[model samples]
Target chain A: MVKINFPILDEPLVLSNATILTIEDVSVYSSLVKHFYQYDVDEDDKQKSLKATELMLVTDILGYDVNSAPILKLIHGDLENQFNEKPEVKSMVEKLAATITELIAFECLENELDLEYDEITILELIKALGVKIETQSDTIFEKCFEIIQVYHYLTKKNLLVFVNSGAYLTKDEVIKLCEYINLMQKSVLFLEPRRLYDLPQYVIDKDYFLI
Target chain B: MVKINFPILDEPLVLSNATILTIEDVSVYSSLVKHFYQYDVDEHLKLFDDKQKSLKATELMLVTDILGYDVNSAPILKLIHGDLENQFNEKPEVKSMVEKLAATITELIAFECLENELDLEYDEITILELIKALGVKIETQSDTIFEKCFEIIQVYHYLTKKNLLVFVNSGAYLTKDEVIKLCEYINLMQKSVLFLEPRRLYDLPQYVIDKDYFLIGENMVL
Candidate 1:
């Protein structure tokens, strides 16, 4: 279990599977995430000098380094960036250019410009050919799955942290993601303002009770 | 034209044609969008840095891709063309296509500038001018309500570039299958979209993720 300890809370929050850390106050929720990222908390008038003083992830003893990039929700650009940055993509582009070099368009361009270009980069070739990268995502499931695949290829971070993912995904999609995370033996920490899903929760109630 | 007021949402409701975008739950939802927009001191969004937020709202750039839909509005045409010219629109194939078209059909017009009668000939017209004359638009008009909603979303994202889209009781406008199709489009687009309903959707599609606040006094913690 990956556990998190905060000074105001009674005990460590455990995350063996999908778990909820319900926050009532907006500032508290904001500040906690700030504290989680180890950033300075914003000043709140309701509670002067309000900030988390002590926090621990209990991750050092887990025998594996735990690093998670904060993702509120997935977006088009993220998927685009991931897809373009894959190593396989570079190999395809680099290899395909060799065959494209002998095309009639290349000969025409060379003759028209009155210059035979022997040295050229892939970017120049792409620009000269006017090749466009079309992102064809017909379904949400494919986009999400492709992003996950790309993210894993980029880094195999065991924990994927999402904040109010329901804001973007439906309940069924969220459940499917949760199931996949468990099926992969990975963990997800869902930080929500109020309880929605009947999941294992570590509630920081209206009072400071970690009920 | 129906004008929108920052304080009142009624004007905007009629502006979008209430049949397509109803405002029954505007109060709960307008505030909800502002919340998601994460304004100063009202910030509650997750997973995004402030840089991303600022990057979303302010930047203006030239984009070259000519949308499939044809636009006839002169102002929209000029605005689109001017931006595209400034940004050095990426693909040159469109320009070459313009070259091919101007060669075959060609354009000519009489110009009376300062009492000097002159003929403006084709091929003399630049790519940017041709674009304006072409009246490029990224949006398509649709008679169907669902497709109109889809077009509005396309305009909202591609043209406006806003990150979050909020709706107040828009689900009532579309059927279950229709709503799911839109949902599929939205998810594929990867937009952060929210649909607010005063009452729950009956047999809501499995694709919908919703929450109910039931802020009644009887349910208050005693």
Candidate 2:
């Protein structure tokens, strides 16, 4: 459970489990999302950080996977570095390093370079191999799958926030995502600028109002 | 200085003057623009990401250019051409300045890896050779409908030979001063704007085709 403690809102909006917050004002919506996503949040985080969110919030425990989409940002980001160091995942990384070294050795010979795999570091190898890992796009449907994947990989977090993704997803798709989302200890909240559906939502209106 | 002498507001809304709306429903503009344009303008509004605000906003600019729009500054990923590397060297000042920025970024990446003893795999990779341009997104602390409407007016001017800026619920997110300030600009620029509000803002400048409404259910335009 958490509370949105912003000044624009007349009431302290609360979120328990799976809920939707339809924000009428776009600035307030973006600021609230920024409250959890980054550390040094603009010039006002110093003043409004405490007054804005009643969150035991740090970016690590907060999942904002909908920065564009979760699929492409899966690797080469902060989340990747954390997830890569996990116990089971590190074991697989050892194998990837070995095989990547072999591929680099052959490529070096093909290019007629006097290079050895011994000089090549694992970090340098993966960086060149590409961290994006190239997944094709379909969006609305693909994003739902990736959102689920990001949650699964973010094993340490219980709170997930997506910006206006509910608007893109269909009624069945959102409900389906909600079903999978409910399987965990969920506090998945979606904040949209306008009301697009007959969602289970709380509205913050034009007149510094809330419900 | 002008008196709007319309009792019922029964005639077509004149775009020569600016207007405002304090409405109950927010999608009123979305609906009004539906029948206003020839193409399916309404359906395309929601297709773009929030950063662009509206797909209509992008298309409105696109229509102007041949029309034209500059996505180079925005956070759009452009595929780099191999030839651009050779082309940049032709300009003496540009080549020297561009090399310094690229070199600075490259040196910093290597500095982090050495100082931190960071693992090469999955740390982070930004190859400068593959980049056409590194875009820095422009941001502001506040996002208001006033700015949204204002930008649309500017886009409208560049977007077409014809200029008609229609706004719905324009003043809902803005204060009285902002509402008045926007109207003053509209008048000065000779940009035709139609502000269709659900109710009259208690205080608005005269000379607009003003219609103030306060109502009880059927047959009341009070």
Candidate 3:
């Protein structure tokens, strides 16, 4: 119920008119989730292609190309150096790299499956891989859906996304991904101020965010 | 001279007419440096006071020291933070000056609270306007809160090359609507911002690096 307005100035600001909704609002979150689900589910071909593109999109965001060398090797090297340099954040780097490589695996499967099956839902595709959802409500789509929902929320509000923590994604990567997905739309992401111990070495050193 | 416009949408978009200048240009960097220097030097009442000079000096040293390390060396932000803190610790004068500046700023706010009976509007928090309202003679430019805010404003102007008011957040204190309004105000002026947060002074996010228009801690959206 708290209403905030921008500074009193002659010019109108960007995102100045958009409403701010809390991230914890279940209604808003569900609305977004449903929107994404409907968008994907309305067409089977679009859904299959969307999932395929999403995997590659996430992979590209993580600083890897579709045809790169075994990502496992790259991740292992990253893990070794990360363990040596900052032993404390080794777990985070490990988890992030593991999930990313898993996504790549998913992308490869998408290509292979598409060659055989004409079209498939992400949920159906995962089930085909024998990756059972824990329960009726649990599925990979829910996890992926949340990220897309967050992105959608950001777009609708004209706000920049801040990558506080979670996942191995860097601020620059998120910005790039948004640009690619959104196309011709500009967005900014502020990486949270935290100890640099957990980030990729290049991210810390190369001014990746500047690009 | 590259102009990147905000997205054009069905509804009139904020910043649709605004332009984004690249941060890497030497001309831009020098222009910003000169702009800051002029602001600090031209004013008879030293807006930067002592803290301004101290921060500038520390920033310069950190910038130079960073060049000696491998460009690809990770965690440069951590290194910069440590070096800056060390600079403050080694030169106790800088630390003392910072503390004194904080006290002076607090006192100014306290004075405003009393004068307004704790009913000051949000616009009154502006550093420049606050100084005009206080009518108090401040000896040093860097000692007052106004000077710190002025620095941000100047930086914004230097980078954006637009005439608009700038607002810096003091943590997550500003309500969601306030942030949106500020965004709109800047957009209408075809202006950009370099909003910084006091909380993120040490470990600035990588996205802030190499940007002339740097928005540190404030979230543009909710």
Per-candidate TM equals: 0.34, 0.38, 0.17
- Model 2 agreement with the true structure over A1-211: per-residue lDDT tens digits: 4455555765666655666778777556545555444423543132233322322231111122333334344444554466466858765766777787788778888886676545544455555665652223223345455555556545445556655454345566667776676675456777666664786788887564775
Higher-scoring candidate on TM-score, 2 or 3:
2
DockQ (Cα-based) for each candidate: 0.01, 0.03, 0.01
- After superposition, which runs of candidate 2 have C-alpha atoms over 4 Å from their true positions? A7-11, A23-115, A119-169, A184-187, A192-198, A203-211, B1-143, B151-222
Q: How well is candidate 1 docked (DockQ)?
A: 0.01
Identify the candidate with maximal TM-score. Answer: 2
- Number of backbone collisions per candidate: 0, 7, 22
User: Residue B122 of model 1: what lDDT?
Assistant: 29
lDDT of candidate 2 over B99-133, digit per residue (tens): 77767777787777777865653333223443434
In terms of DockQ, which candidate is strongest?
2
Query: Runs in model 1 with CA error above 4 Å?
Result: A25-27, A37-150, A156-159, B1-222
CAPRI-style quality class for the chain A–B interface of candidate 2: incorrect
Error at B173, model 1, angstroms: 31
> Candidate 2's error at B129, in angstroms?
27
